[PDB]
Each structure stands twice: as C-alpha cells, then as structure tokens.
C-alpha cells in the first residue's frame, strides 16, 4: 500500500467539503448538488439559470475570490435528454484553491454568456458554439473560431463522424480548391477493445 499507491490528503478533503456546504447554503436557488472527489477536487452542480449569479458570487465574494477562469468546455452525452454538459474550471489565487462548476443544456436552449463575469470566456464560448452547437445569449461576437469557413456541422458531437463528410482537393479545370464527399483509400479500422469481465467493483451499477 505504501510504495505504488498515491497518498490521500484528508485535511484538504475536509476543507473542500466545508466550502461546498458553505456555497450550497448561500445559493440554494441554483445549487442542485455538491461533490468532492477522492483525489481532492470539488464540483458544484447548478441549474442553467444560475450561471451568472453563481459565477459572480464565486468571483466577488471575500471568502471565494476565484478571479481566474482556468477553462470552459463542453461534454456531449447523447443518452441524456439534456445533451450537453458545460464545465467551468476556476482558480483562486487568494486561497490557493480550485473549483469546478457544472450545468447542462440541449440543442435548442441557449446558455447565458459569462463574458461580463470573465473576459477570458469570450473565446471559450466561441469554441463551444463551433464544436458543439451550443448557443450563448448576449455574446459580444459569436461566430466560428476553429473550423473552416462555411463548415457545416459540429465535429465534437458523438454522432459526427471522425473523418467528416467532405474533403478538399485542387481541381485544375476550375483552377481552385474544391470540396467533395469523403472517399478513403483505407477505411479507419474500428477496434473492439473492452473486456467482457468487469474491472472495478466499486462502480458497479444496480441491475435495474
């Protein structure tokens, strides 16, 4: 148990649990769940309507002071009615701590832009819109950031194919670069790797 196993810090775990209870007490209108992982990371699950109040409180409160937006991204889980999960990663320099704020949305429901709260969010929101198709309300300038001009679809969605639908080549007759349906000399070969024997009993699901 000593040499090869990562050590666990109990003191940090206690502090993060207490701060999660604190935040949940102060904002009962939006907090749906508070969690602390066993490797010492704190998560806060909120209702989409509380994006702005929660982030503002965590930025401006004296006991919080998470003044930096470390990262903002999305995760797609097609089995859920609300397809998309929005994740905010915040870092506090005053208290040397990190926090994670989560919410959810689907294809047709916009999320409020967090640009007023954080200047850094402007590019991240653009990337979320480009890759997933999530619309952010009141964005200063929302448009594609990573994909080619006129690109159709959102490539980070699970349903989108890995190689896409079109390719590019140069055509001498029209003397320009043209787009055509993807054709592959060698098809990507799909592997089935998962073991039919369960690996982790601590995560077993009830048999429904």
């Amino acid at each position: 148990t000593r040499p090869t196993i990562r050590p666990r810090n109990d003191v940090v775990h206690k502090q993060l649990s207490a701060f999660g209870q604190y935040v949940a007490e102060i904002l009962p209108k939006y907090v749906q769940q508070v969690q602390v992982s066993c490797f010492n990371e704190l998560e806060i699950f909120i209702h989409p309507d509380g994006v702005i109040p929660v982030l503002t409180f965590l930025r401006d409160h004296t006991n919080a002071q998470f003044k930096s937006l470390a990262d903002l991204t999305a995760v797609d889980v097609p089995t859920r009615q609300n397809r998309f999960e929005i994740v905010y990663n915040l870092l506090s320099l005053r208290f040397n701590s990190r926090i994670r704020v989560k919410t959810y949305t689907d294809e047709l429901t916009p999320i409020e832009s967090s640009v007023t709260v954080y200047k850094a969010a402007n590019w991240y929101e653009r990337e979320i819109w480009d890759m997933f198709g999530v619309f952010f309300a009141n964005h200063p300038d929302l448009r594609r950031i990573l994909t080619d001009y006129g690109f159709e679809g959102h490539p980070f969605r699970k349903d989108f194919p890995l190689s896409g639908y079109v390719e590019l080549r140069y055509d001498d007759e029209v003397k320009r670069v043209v787009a055509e349906p993807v054709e592959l000399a060698q098809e990507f070969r799909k592997f089935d790797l998962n073991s039919p024997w369960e690996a982790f009993p601590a995560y077993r699901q009830p048999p429904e």
Partner: protein, 112 residues
C-alpha cells in the same frame, strides 16, 4: 508613505482606514435590506464586522495588513468594493429562495 504597491494599475491609497470604514459601512447598509435568515447576509455581516473591528483597532497600516491577512491593503480596499458590488447584485437576484426546477432523473449520473 509607501510607493509602488507592486501591482500594475493599482495606485497607492492615502488615508486607507477612512476608505475601509466607508466601504464596510456601505456594505453593512446594503446587507441590512436582505432577509435576516438568508445565509449570505449573516455570513457577509460576520466577516465584514470582523474586518471593520480589526480596522478600527490598528492605526499602523503594516500591522493592519498582517492582521487582515488580505494582501496589501490596497487590494483589501478593492475586495471591499467588489463585495459591495456583489451585495447589490445579490439583493437584486435573491438567490436565497428555494431551488427552481430539479434536474432530470439521470442528468448527473456517471458513468453514462
């Protein structure tokens, strides 16, 4: 007396005790309009009362800085202004009300 706080764009404040007293009094005034049982009001009142009491009890700004544990009294003033702005916003938002719209049945279930 001090020059160059060391952070770009943060000017040195003369008479910082008066500024801190004014800001803490304004924070308490704003908090007075929030319902008494709201957690935000009581927690913020407790912390700002501690800070105001420590400000009133120390004339030396360096020992006040080391007592507040707030990092260079100018940023303490900036934090007080941030807290006052947050207090006004919170008064407008009223986040002490009960939770709205519980999530779907398996919204947060992982894995899958």
């Amino acid at each position: 007396l001090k020059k160059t706080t060391g952070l770009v764009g943060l000017a040195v404040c003369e008479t910082p005790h008066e500024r801190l007293k004014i800001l803490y009094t304004k924070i308490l005034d704003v908090l007075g309009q929030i319902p008494k049982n709201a957690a935000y009001r009581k927690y913020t009142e407790q912390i700002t009362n501690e800070k105001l009491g420590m400000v009133k009890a120390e004339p030396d700004v360096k020992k006040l800085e080391e007592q507040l544990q707030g990092g260079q009294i100018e940023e303490v003033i900036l934090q007080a202004e941030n807290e006052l702005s947050l207090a006004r916003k919170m008064l407008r938002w009223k986040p002490w009300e009960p939770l709205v719209e519980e999530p779907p049945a398996n919204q947060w279930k992982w894995p899958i």
